[PDB]
Design a protein around this motif. Structure first.
Motif, PDB file in Angstrom:
ATOM      1  N   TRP A  76       6.415  -0.596 -11.892  1.00  0.00           N
ATOM      2  CA  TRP A  76       7.350   0.491 -11.650  1.00  0.00           C
ATOM      3  C   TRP A  76       8.758   0.056 -12.013  1.00  0.00           C
ATOM      4  O   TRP A  76       9.135  -1.099 -11.809  1.00  0.00           O
ATOM      5  CB  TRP A  76       7.305   0.922 -10.189  1.00  0.00           C
ATOM      6  N   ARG A 103       3.046   2.249  -3.399  1.00  0.00           N
ATOM      7  CA  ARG A 103       2.409   2.854  -4.563  1.00  0.00           C
ATOM      8  C   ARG A 103       2.411   4.370  -4.476  1.00  0.00           C
ATOM      9  O   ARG A 103       2.592   5.054  -5.488  1.00  0.00           O
ATOM     10  CB  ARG A 103       0.982   2.341  -4.723  1.00  0.00           C
ATOM     11  N   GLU A 104       2.201   4.920  -3.286  1.00  0.00           N
ATOM     12  CA  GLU A 104       2.048   6.360  -3.174  1.00  0.00           C
ATOM     13  C   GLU A 104       3.351   7.099  -2.918  1.00  0.00           C
ATOM     14  O   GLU A 104       3.345   8.331  -2.892  1.00  0.00           O
ATOM     15  CB  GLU A 104       1.038   6.701  -2.078  1.00  0.00           C
ATOM     16  N   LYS A 146       6.490   4.646 -14.458  1.00  0.00           N
ATOM     17  CA  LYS A 146       5.722   3.656 -15.205  1.00  0.00           C
ATOM     18  C   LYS A 146       5.971   3.909 -16.685  1.00  0.00           C
ATOM     19  O   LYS A 146       5.245   4.655 -17.336  1.00  0.00           O
ATOM     20  CB  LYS A 146       4.242   3.736 -14.865  1.00  0.00           C
ATOM     21  N   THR A 186      -5.789  -5.454 -11.352  1.00  0.00           N
ATOM     22  CA  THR A 186      -4.958  -4.650 -12.232  1.00  0.00           C
ATOM     23  C   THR A 186      -3.643  -4.355 -11.529  1.00  0.00           C
ATOM     24  O   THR A 186      -3.581  -4.309 -10.299  1.00  0.00           O
ATOM     25  CB  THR A 186      -5.650  -3.348 -12.621  1.00  0.00           C
ATOM     26  N   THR A 221       3.055  -4.514  -8.714  1.00  0.00           N
ATOM     27  CA  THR A 221       2.204  -4.504  -7.530  1.00  0.00           C
ATOM     28  C   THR A 221       0.735  -4.453  -7.917  1.00  0.00           C
ATOM     29  O   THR A 221       0.368  -3.918  -8.963  1.00  0.00           O
ATOM     30  CB  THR A 221       2.504  -3.317  -6.607  1.00  0.00           C
ATOM     31  N   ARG A 222      -0.101  -5.015  -7.051  1.00  0.00           N
ATOM     32  CA  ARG A 222      -1.544  -4.873  -7.177  1.00  0.00           C
ATOM     33  C   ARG A 222      -1.953  -3.439  -6.868  1.00  0.00           C
ATOM     34  O   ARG A 222      -1.353  -2.781  -6.017  1.00  0.00           O
ATOM     35  CB  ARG A 222      -2.241  -5.846  -6.229  1.00  0.00           C
ATOM     36  N   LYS A 223      -2.980  -2.949  -7.561  1.00  0.00           N
ATOM     37  CA  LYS A 223      -3.341  -1.542  -7.424  1.00  0.00           C
ATOM     38  C   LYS A 223      -4.334  -1.301  -6.293  1.00  0.00           C
ATOM     39  O   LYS A 223      -4.127  -0.404  -5.470  1.00  0.00           O
ATOM     40  CB  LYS A 223      -3.906  -1.018  -8.740  1.00  0.00           C
ATOM     41  N   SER A 224      -5.399  -2.070  -6.230  1.00  0.00           N
ATOM     42  CA  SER A 224      -6.459  -1.780  -5.275  1.00  0.00           C
ATOM     43  C   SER A 224      -5.993  -2.049  -3.847  1.00  0.00           C
ATOM     44  O   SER A 224      -5.173  -2.939  -3.618  1.00  0.00           O
ATOM     45  CB  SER A 224      -7.686  -2.624  -5.570  1.00  0.00           C
ATOM     46  N   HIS A 252       0.823  -1.201   0.000  1.00  0.00           N
ATOM     47  CA  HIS A 252       0.000   0.000   0.000  1.00  0.00           C
ATOM     48  C   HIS A 252       0.860   1.255   0.000  1.00  0.00           C
ATOM     49  O   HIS A 252       0.593   2.203  -0.744  1.00  0.00           O
ATOM     50  CB  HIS A 252      -0.931  -0.007   1.207  1.00  0.00           C
ATOM     51  N   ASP A 264       0.407  -2.408 -11.408  1.00  0.00           N
ATOM     52  CA  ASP A 264       1.370  -1.368 -11.733  1.00  0.00           C
ATOM     53  C   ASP A 264       2.742  -1.993 -11.920  1.00  0.00           C
ATOM     54  O   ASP A 264       3.115  -2.913 -11.186  1.00  0.00           O
ATOM     55  CB  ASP A 264       1.445  -0.321 -10.625  1.00  0.00           C
TER      56      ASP A 264
END
Ligand SMILES: [Mg+2]
Ligand SMILES: [Mg+2]
Ligand SMILES: [Mg+2]
Ligand SMILES: [Mg+2]
Ligand SMILES: [Mg+2]
Ligand SMILES: [Mg+2]
Ligand SMILES: [Mg+2]
Ligand SMILES: [Mg+2]
Ligand SMILES: [Mg+2]
Ligand SMILES: [Mg+2]
Ligand SMILES: [Mg+2]
Ligand SMILES: [Mg+2]
Ligand SMILES: [Mg+2]
Ligand SMILES: [Mg+2]
Ligand SMILES: [Zn+2]
Lengths: 196, 64, 55, 100
Positions: free
Chosen positions: D63, C43-44, C53, D59, D48-51, C40, D61
């Motif tokens: 990187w 990603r941010e 990306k 879906t 990585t998984r997005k949700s 989690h 990502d």
RNA sequence: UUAAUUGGAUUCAACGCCGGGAACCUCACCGGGGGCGACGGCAGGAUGAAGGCCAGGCUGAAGGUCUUGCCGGACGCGCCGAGAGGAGGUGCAUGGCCGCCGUCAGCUCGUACCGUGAGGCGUCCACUUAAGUGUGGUAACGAGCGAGACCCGCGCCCCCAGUUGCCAGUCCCUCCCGCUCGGGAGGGAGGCACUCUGGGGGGACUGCCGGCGAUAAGCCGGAGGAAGGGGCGGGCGACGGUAGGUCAGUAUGCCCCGAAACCCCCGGGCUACACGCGCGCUACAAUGGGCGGGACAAUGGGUGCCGACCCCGAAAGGGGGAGGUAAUCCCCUAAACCCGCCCUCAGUUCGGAUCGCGGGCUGCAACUCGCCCGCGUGAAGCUGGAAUCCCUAGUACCCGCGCGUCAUCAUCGCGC
């Protein structure tokens, strides 16, 4: 190996930046920079109110240096404080300012229009502001303010527009603020000029 | 579909009127002229503009 | 002593030996090249670390 | 009597600037330098998984982080060694020198 | 069903999903045992508060408590407020993020004009496009976001660069063969030719030719070309809606527990089993099974680690241990495929579920509840009703490998 070295340094900056962003909120924090010298580390901090950072003749800079050296892995730090270069072209600063204005008690329309007017006056091609939360009631809502030119989809929108986000903590809950700004020097791919 | 884009046509028409005696019915010559007379940086856009200019030249020469 | 009934055992393997350095969550920890971050949190903060990306 | 220089950065342009500076330093002196050898690029890829939850379609990502490298060999001349020892590299470039 | 078998998600858009491959931890559930109240004040307190301990009982085990007496000196949950903390309630109080309508072609604005008004026009018509993509006609004339443009990779050519990558031609030394006219293999010099690696550049534009359409927008068919008509494969998802999912990743309002709904430790459970369903693996054999022999990869990863090479053992494994922080050393001499022999249409030399005995590895711990090896045993299954899924080219089918998770464990996900 070599990859582990690059990643290790990148994490330190992220942690330090988040800590400073949470700490120096009232001073209009606007980013930092770290340089390495044979004597140690030069740490430059950008803010709009350097007096708050210094804190009445030291007593705060010393604490920050001690925290940076102990809690984080910086060796022999040295903190310099400067002034933000283009305050009206930095989306993060404007977002935090709008959040603080909302926390004071101003109606969100006035705050949004004042911010847009100032930003467009300082020579920006376009700006967009979005405010979401429990505005005027217990059913949530979102509103959007816009004027100018602004790219949203594609590579240019990724590398030219500046984006910022902030939270405003009111009595009834949190309010989310998003700001996007396009600099005056941005040139889209389909803007071609004839040489005279 | 191969539909020419609006700004390509606009800039091509602007160039054609500014220097009417500068382009021929040859693709290479038009390509070099378009490269030198504008600030275009994409190799694809240059080719599109040169092609449309070539069509314009051969069309006006025919008299439409 | 009364304080001894609050200290945890210092484990060295298992899901309980690794926590996210940003949020403290157990479980989905990314261990590649020394990162210690949740799926989690990564990603941010990925753009700040220099990831992109491309495709 | 030869020195080996290894350069690595996440930005290609800074690496090129440093390499050109070393090349010009060698040019302004009588000293032979084997050209900057390009070593293979390092790619670090993370999927990585997005949700945050598990509901909905899955879906992902992808990187990526890229690290470029160069290699330069030059013979140890004290007149030329001092110049490269004093050149200043940007903060996003890593340099290491060794004598072989 | 149970002491508990923690909880969320139910058409597409729940069911190898929550990166959910849980032995402890994770943990939120069940049985049992301990610990915690900044800061204000009330009883109390050097004539010693709060706190800690040798041995021995209680106990699963415990100065936790008690017995037995030795410590330490200033605060004080026995009492009232208040507070830390909460995977406790509410996703129908919120932020952020994500799925779907949908990578569909839509959503709007300035002035003018029409209508009492809600509204309309532009955004309509014909042709065209993957596209509100364009060309003409029009009470509309012009703009914005989306589409396109843009960014990354693949395929062809040129310049520069030559190590840790490459070895063709030239020289020297050694060893084999049909005895060496000839032909091979190593090593050293030596080189950047070729391959490769990575910076810069070229190349394709409906540009050329013939038709259709209007002579416009375009469409159809050819030449040359590595490539031909978004060249091929990806990233980026407009204004909004869905009271769609998430407060059990993090942030956060209200309500609750606040000496237990907070914090630790031990043992259980999430792994139960008349049964219904989803996604898969292995087969039902010759378009094969077994035994011996012969061939050819790529992506990635390595110091809490990858480990060549030698020795011991039938196997799984065991004892030493070079080099490697890596274009240098290692994982790493893949399988399907090919050649020779046995079996010849059979519940079999097909299938390998289930169970017995024995040997190992990781780990603090292998019974509940892990993985590997040897011998033995040998279940259903002989092609599948009504129904129903995926796929247009290096794609589908068939075959293995790498990484993630990870002390040990891959019938999974993402890639090759
Ligand atoms: Mg799994
Ligand atoms: Mg398990
Ligand atoms: Mg457990
Ligand atoms: Mg009127
Ligand atoms: Mg209409
Ligand atoms: Mg459009
Ligand atoms: Mg696009
Ligand atoms: Mg909802
Ligand atoms: Mg709901
Ligand atoms: Mg389960
Ligand atoms: Mg259940
Ligand atoms: Mg068999
Ligand atoms: Mg067992
Ligand atoms: Mg049969
Ligand atoms: Zn995290």
């Amino acid at each position: 190996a070599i990859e582990r070295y690059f990643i290790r340094e990148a994490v330190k900056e992220m942690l330090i930046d988040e800590f400073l962003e949470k700490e120096l909120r009232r001073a209009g924090y606007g980013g930092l920079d770290i340089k390495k010298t044979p004597l140690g580390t030069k740490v430059i901090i950008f803010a709009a109110n350097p007096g708050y950072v210094i804190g009445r003749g030291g007593r705060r800079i010393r604490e920050l240096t001690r925290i940076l050296e102990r809690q984080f892995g910086l060796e022999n730090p040295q903190i310099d404080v400067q002034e933000i270069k283009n305050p009206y072209l930095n989306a993060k600063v404007q977002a935090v300012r709008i959040a603080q204005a909302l926390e004071r008690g101003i109606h969100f329309r006035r705050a949004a229009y004042a911010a847009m007017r100032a930003i467009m006056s300082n020579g920006a091609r376009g700006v967009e502001i979005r405010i979401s939360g429990k505005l005027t009631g217990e059913r949530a809502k979102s509103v959007r303010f816009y004027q100018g030119y602004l790219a949203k989809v594609g590579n240019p929108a990724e590398t030219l527009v500046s984006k910022g986000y902030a939270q405003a903590l009111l009595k009834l809950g949190v309010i989310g603020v998003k700001v996007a700004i396009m600099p005056p020097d941005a040139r889209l791919p389909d803007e071609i000029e004839i040489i005279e | 579909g191969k539909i020419r884009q609006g700004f390509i046509k606009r800039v091509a028409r602007e160039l054609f009127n500014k220097y009417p005696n500068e382009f021929t019915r040859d693709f290479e010559h038009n390509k070099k002229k378009v490269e030198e007379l504008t600030n275009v940086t994409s190799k694809k856009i240059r080719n599109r503009i040169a092609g449309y200019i070539t069509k314009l030249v051969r069309m006006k020469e025919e008299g439409k | 002593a009364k304080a001894d009934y609050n200290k945890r055992k210092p484990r060295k393997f298992g899901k309980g030996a690794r926590r996210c350095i940003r949020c403290g969550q157990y479980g989905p920890i990314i261990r590649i090249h020394g990162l210690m971050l949740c799926r989690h949190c990564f990603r941010e903060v990925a753009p700040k670390l220099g990831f992109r990306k491309y495709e | 009597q030869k020195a080996r220089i290894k350069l690595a950065s996440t930005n290609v342009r800074s690496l090129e600037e440093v390499a050109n500076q070393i090349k010009q330093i060698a040019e302004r002196t009588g000293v032979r330098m084997s050209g900057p050898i390009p070593l293979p690029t390092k790619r670090i890829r993370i999927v990585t998984r997005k949700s945050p939850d598990g509901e909905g379609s899955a879906t992902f990502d992808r990187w990526e982080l890229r690290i470029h490298k160069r290699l330069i060999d030059i013979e140890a001349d004290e007149r030329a060694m001092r110049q490269i020892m004093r050149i200043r590299v940007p903060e996003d470039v890593t340099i290491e020198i060794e004598l072989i």
